[PDB]
Design a protein around this ligand. Structure first.
Ligand SMILES: Nc1nc2c(ncn2[C@@H]2O[C@H](COP(=O)(O)OP(=O)(O)O)[C@@H](O)[C@H]2O)c(=O)[nH]1
Length: 440
């Protein structure tokens, strides 16, 4: 089913975004049926967006509200940070638009236009190029006059509010995640957000939001799985990088393994500890077979994405040099070694997402998107310390979701510090970065 259990709206033009509909030629159908309520929510959201979207008479009238202090309200995402982050933060702001009956508009920035097709049937998601406040986006931060957190800090009705939700955000910026301040913010027609985190899990802890979030997602850990596949379709340019790598190197395997390598160090390596970690991970989980020194089969292909190439070479040369214990036929394959960039990094994510089993590196938003769109619950390569291969080398994700790296820890009722990862069974601390949070 090319509309994804009904997640996607039929009627888009096939040739201008090939990936949208002919993705089902390349991926096994997802196990995760999106609920009836999520569906309606999206179909209803596209009526809002057509009704209030850029270029309508309702969008023109609303723009004058930026001076003279309103049926359409808006959240504006600003393009900021690495591609992994911008995908996760953008799905976040879109869930948030859903919860607050707003229109999402997207600062195209340098490249968003080039990377992604239009996800909303009948009408562009892109912020116009003449939107008056675009010159301020670089500068908007924690100390800007209309920053919600600067205002709560310094006790201060508004046409527009800036919401600073970047990882270095403070105690007052974080009040965004409270019911009280949401009631306030609820009234403001224009919201400009800049953000580099997957902030979805803290929305489940806001009351009101949590009812609707339960109704939309009966299987709670499907938020980015459905919202990602809804929103983000690669352009023809990027899609062809996907199809041509998949076609040339991966379509003849009985099984595909993905291995997403990120190493957090200012030396590119490669590192023996990390190679060691990857083989122990893959072997100890029966993901890839062992090899024998002193000596009707299946073909596995291993897709290795990384910046240094010698993680893939090592595996490639091991499996060329030595026969597998099981007699399985292994081929290792790395697209790029970057040391058309973001078109590439994008394709590689989507490629990772077509594998049957994925290994991810701890902390990488690159992993989270790949597992995210795959509907894949990874085995996570844990974060090293002192150039030592951790032991155990990896473990299975509690679930497929991305991880909220910089969450708030406030009890809004009681007005005090709290561990927000020990309030409800579905919001747990992360496996990879224990400080962060995620839906399980
Ligand atoms: N093509 C490709 N790009 C990558 C890979 N890993 C990371 N990148 C990109 O390189 C840039 C820096 O990556 P990363 O270190 O993961 O992000 P940071 O930690 O937020 O700087 C980002 O724009 C990523 O999209 C990869 O395996 N392949």
């Amino acid at each position: 089913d090319k509309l994804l259990g009904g997640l996607l709206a039929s009627g888009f033009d096939e040739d201008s975004c090939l990936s949208r509909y002919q993705s089902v030629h390349y991926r096994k159908p997802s196990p995760y049926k999106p609920s009836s309520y999520l569906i309606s929510k999206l179909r209803n959201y596209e009526k809002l967006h057509k009704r209030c979207g850029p270029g309508t008479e309702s969008y023109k009238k609303a723009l004058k509200q930026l001076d003279q202090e309103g049926e359409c309200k808006y959240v504006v995402w600003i393009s900021f940070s690495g591609l992994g982050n911008r995908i996760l933060s953008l799905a976040s702001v879109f869930l948030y638009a859903l919860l607050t009956d707003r229109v999402l508009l997207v600062d195209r920035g340098k490249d968003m236009d080039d990377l992604f097709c239009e996800p909303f049937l009948g009408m562009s998601w892109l912020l116009p190029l003449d939107f008056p406040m675009t010159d301020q986006f670089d500068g908007l931060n924690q100390e800007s006059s209309r920053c919600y957190g600067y205002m709560v800090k310094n006790q201060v009705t508004l046409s527009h509010l800036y919401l600073h939700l970047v990882h270095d955000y403070g105690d007052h910026d974080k009040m965004f995640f409270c019911e009280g301040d949401q009631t306030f913010i609820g009234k403001v027609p224009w919201l400009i957000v800049k953000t580099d985190n997957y902030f979805v899990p803290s929305l489940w802890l806001i009351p009101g939001f949590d009812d609707e979030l339960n109704k939309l997602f009966p299987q709670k850990a499907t938020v980015f799985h459905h919202l990602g596949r809804y929103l983000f379709h690669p352009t023809n340019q990027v899609w062809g990088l996907v199809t041509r790598y998949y076609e040339a190197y991966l379509s003849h395997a009985d099984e595909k393994i993905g291995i997403q390598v990120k190493v957090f160090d200012e030396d590119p390596g490669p590192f023996q500890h990390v190679m060691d970690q990857i083989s122990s991970c893959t072997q100890k989980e029966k993901l890839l077979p062992e090899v024998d020194t002193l000596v009707t089969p299946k073909h596995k292909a291993v897709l290795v994405t990384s910046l240094n190439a010698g993680y893939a070479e090592n595996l490639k040369s091991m499996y060329w040099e030595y026969p597998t214990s099981t007699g399985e036929i292994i081929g290792v394959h790395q697209p790029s070694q970057e040391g058309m960039h973001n078109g590439k990094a994008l394709a590689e994510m989507y490629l990772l997402s077509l594998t049957d089993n994925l290994v991810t590196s701890a902390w990488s938003t690159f992993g989270y998107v790949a597992q995210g769109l795959g509907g894949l619950k990874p085995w996570i390569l844990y974060r090293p310390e002192n150039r030592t291969t951790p032991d155990p080398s990896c473990g299975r994700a509690m679930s497929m979701e991305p991880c909220f790296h910089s969450p708030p820890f406030y009890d809004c009722k009681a007005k005090t510090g709290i561990d927000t990862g020990t309030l409800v069974p579905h919001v747990r601390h992360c496996e990879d970065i224990s400080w962060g949070l995620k839906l399980v």
